[PDB]
C-alpha cells in the first residue's frame, strides 16, 4: 500500500444513561407478546463509544415488528419536535425486546438492521429482555451485523474488531453464525451520575411515618397473643425433635423434609418478627413521651 488500508478494529461499547435504560425496560415490557421497538437518540463520541442519551418508542401494527407502522414520517416529525425542546440529537441505533428467551437476532431481525446499515453506517441494535432481566443484572446486550460476504471471501478471520470479552452460550443457537457470521457482541456500560443517584435513592417520606406514629395498642396485643401461642405449639414438637435427632444418623435428619413445622427454623422465624416488633414496639412509645412532651 502507498496509503492506509480500510480499518475497523475497535472495542465498541455503549453507554446507556440511567435515564434511557428505565425507558427501554418499561416500554419494552409493555409488549410481552408482540415485542416493541424504538429509536435511540444520543451522540457518538470519537469512534470507540456510542452514547445513547435517550430513546423513544415507535408505533407498530398488530401482528409484530412491522416496518409499515415504522413510518419515516413518524421519526421525522418526532425529530423536529425534539429539536424544539433542546435535544440536538441524531439516530444512533434501534432497540427491541425478545422477551422470555435469549438475546439474539432473528432472520427478520438481522435483515431489518441491514436497513439501518444502508441509511447509516453506525448502528447498534440493542436488546432488552423485560422478563428474564427481572431483578439483578438486567439482561441487555448489543449487536452489530457483520459483512457475511467479506467473510466468505477470506476476511472471515478479519471480522475480529478488538473487543474485550466475557463469553455467552444460550444464544449459540444463532450466535454461532451470529457472533461468528452475522453480527457480534458489543459490551454494555452505564454512567451513574451523582444527581440521578441522589434522586432515585429517595423512596420514603418519613416525617409522618414511624417514630411520629405507632400501631394501635389493641391491634398490638392481638398480635402478641397469636404468636406467643404458636410458640407453644412449636415448642412441643421441638422436644419431640430433640429426642429423635439424638437416636439417628445425619442422613435421616438430612432428608427430613416432611413437616418443616417441627424444627428450630420456625422458632427463629418467629422470635425475630416478635422481637422486632416489639422492641421497637417498645422505643416508639418512650421516644414520643419526650419528643412531644
Amino acid at each position: 500500500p502507498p496509503t492506509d488500508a480500510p480499518a475497523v478494529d475497535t472495542a465498541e461499547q455503549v453507554y446507556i444513561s440511567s435515564l434511557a435504560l428505565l425507558k427501554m425496560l418499561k416500554h419494552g415490557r409493555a409488549g410481552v407478546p408482540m415485542e416493541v421497538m424504538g429509536l435511540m437518540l444520543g451522540e457518538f463520541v470519537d469512534d470507540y463509544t456510542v452514547r445513547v442519551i435517550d430513546v423513544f418508542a415507535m408505533p407498530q401494527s398488530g401482528t409484530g415488528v412491522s416496518v409499515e407502522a415504522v413510518d419515516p414520517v413518524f421519526q421525522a416529525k418526532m425529530l423536529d419536535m425534539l429539536k424544539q425542546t433542546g435535544r440536538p440529537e441524531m439516530v444512533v441505533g434501534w432497540y427491541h425486546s425478545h422477551p422470555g428467551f435469549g438475546c439474539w437476532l432473528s432472520g427478520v431481525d438481522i435483515n431489518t438492521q441491514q436497513s439501518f446499515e444502508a441509511l447509516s453506517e453506525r448502528a447498534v441494535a440493542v436488546v432488552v429482555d423485560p422478563i428474564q432481566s427481572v431483578k439483578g443484572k438486567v439482561v441487555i446486550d448489543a449487536f452489530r451485523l457483520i459483512n457475511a460476504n467479506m467473510m466468505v471471501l477470506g476476511h472471515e478471520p478479519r471480522q475480529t474488531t478488538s473487543n474485550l470479552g466475557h463469553l455467552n452460550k444460550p444464544s449459540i443457537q444463532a450466535l454461532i453464525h451470529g457472533l461468528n457470521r452475522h453480527y457480534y457482541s458489543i459490551t454494555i456500560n452505564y454512567r451513574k451520575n451523582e444527581l440521578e443517584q441522589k434522586m432515585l435513592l429517595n423512596l420514603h417520606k418519613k416525617s409522618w411515618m414511624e417514630g411520629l406514629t405507632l400501631q394501635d395498642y389493641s391491634e398490638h396485643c392481638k398480635h402478641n397473643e397469636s404468636v406467643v401461642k404458636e410458640m407453644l405449639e412449636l415448642a412441643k414438637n421441638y422436644n419431640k425433635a430433640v429426642e429423635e435427632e439424638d437416636k439417628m444418623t445425619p442422613e435421616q435428619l438430612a432428608i427430613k423434609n416432611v413437616g418443616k413445622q417441627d424444627p428450630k427454623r420456625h422458632l427463629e422465624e418467629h422470635v425475630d418478627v416478635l422481637m422486632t416488633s416489639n422492641i421497637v414496639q417498645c422505643l416508639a412509645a418512650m421516644l414520643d413521651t419526650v419528643v412531644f412532651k
Binding site: 440511567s18 419536535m81 441522589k198 416525617s207 406467643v228 422486632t276
Partner: protein, 292 residues
C-alpha cells in the same frame, strides 16, 4: 379535593429521572429557571399514577409575572404522538421544577386545564437536599372565606409519594448497587425510620418558628388563618391527662418486656443447642482426623 377523586399522587422513578434530565436539556445559560412539562398517566380512584412526561418549550420573564409562554400547540401535537404509541395515556397534570411555588403558577394551571379537569402540579426538585420526598402535589381548587374576600384560585396540598412497577423496581435496583442499602437488616432499618423521622419534625417545626418570628418582627402582614390552626396544635399536645396516662403507659410497657423476655430466652436456648451440635460434630471429626 373535597371530591374523593384525588389524594395519592404516585410518581414512578423514570419520571423523576425524566424531569431531572429535562432540567439539563434546557440547561445552557437558560438554567436557573422554572422548566415545565406535562404529566401523562392513568388513574381510577383516589390516585393519579404518573408515568410519562415530556418537556414543553416554556419561557417566563425574570421580574414580571404576566409574561409567560407555553407552546400549547406543541402539546396538542405530542400528546397525540405518544397516544399513537400507548393507549390509556391521558394528561393527568403537569410538573414545574420548583424550587417552590410562584404566583404565576395558577395562570399555567388554566392553560393546562383546557385539556383535563383535575390537573395537578407536581413540584419536583433539581437539587437533592430535602430529607422527605422531592415530590409535592398540589391541586387548583377554589373556596370562600369567613373574612368575606372574593373567591380565589388557591393551591391545596395532597399527600404524595413514589411507587413502582417490576420494570421500574428492577432498573432502580440495578442503579443502586453502588450505594448499597440492603446490608442493613430489619430492626436497624426501623430504628433508622424513627431517628430520620425526628429529622423531619425538627425542620418542619423549625420552619413554623421562622415564620412566626417573621410576622412578629420584620413585619409581614398577619394571616389570621395560620395562627388559628397554630392554636389547635397547642391544644392537641398530650398533656392534661398526665397522672392516669402515666400509670397506664407503664403497664403496657411491662407487658412488652414480658414478651421480650420470653423471646430472648427461647433464642438463647436454641442457639445453645446449636453449640451442642457443633461440639458433637467436632468429637466425631476428631475420630476421623486420626485413623490412618
Amino acid at each position: 379535593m373535597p371530591e374523593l377523586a384525588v389524594q395519592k399522587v404516585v410518581v414512578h422513578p423514570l419520571v423523576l429521572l425524566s424531569v431531572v434530565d429535562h432540567f439539563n436539556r434546557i440547561g445552557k445559560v437558560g438554567n436557573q429557571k422554572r422548566v415545565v412539562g406535562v404529566l401523562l398517566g392513568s388513574w381510577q380512584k383516589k390516585v393519579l399514577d404518573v408515568s410519562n412526561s415530556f418537556a414543553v418549550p416554556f419561557d417566563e420573564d425574570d421580574k414580571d409575572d404576566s409574561v409567560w409562554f407555553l407552546d400549547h400547540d406543541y402539546l396538542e401535537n405530542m400528546y397525540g404522538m405518544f397516544k399513537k404509541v400507548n393507549a390509556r395515556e391521558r394528561i393527568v397534570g403537569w410538573y414545574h421544577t420548583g424550587p417552590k411555588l410562584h404566583k404565576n403558577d395558577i395562570a399555567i394551571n388554566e392553560l393546562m386545564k383546557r385539556y383535563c379537569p383535575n390537573s395537578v402540579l407536581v413540584i419536583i426538585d433539581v437539587k437533592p437536599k430535602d430529607l422527605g420526598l422531592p415530590t409535592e402535589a398540589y391541586i387548583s381548587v377554589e373556596e370562600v372565606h369567613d373574612d368575606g374576600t372574593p373567591t380565589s384560585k388557591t393551591f391545596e396540598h395532597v399527600t404524595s409519594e413514589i411507587g413502582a412497577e417490576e420494570a421500574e423496581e428492577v432498573g432502580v435496583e440495578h442503579l443502586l448497587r453502588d450505594i448499597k442499602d440492603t446490608t442493613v437488616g430489619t430492626l436497624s432499618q426501623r430504628i433508622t425510620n424513627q431517628v430520620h423521622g425526628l429529622k423531619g419534625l425538627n425542620s418542619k417545626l423549625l420552619d413554623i418558628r421562622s415564620y412566626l418570628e417573621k410576622v412578629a418582627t420584620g413585619k409581614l402582614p398577619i394571616n389570621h388563618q395560620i395562627i388559628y390552626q397554630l392554636q389547635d396544635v397547642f391544644n392537641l399536645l398530650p398533656d392534661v391527662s398526665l397522672q392516669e396516662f402515666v400509670k397506664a403507659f407503664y403497664l403496657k410497657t411491662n407487658d412488652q418486656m414480658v414478651v421480650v423476655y420470653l423471646a430472648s430466652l427461647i433464642r438463647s436456648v436454641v442457639a445453645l443447642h446449636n453449640l451442642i451440635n457443633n461440639k458433637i460434630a467436632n468429637r466425631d471429626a476428631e475420630k476421623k482426623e486420626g485413623q490412618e
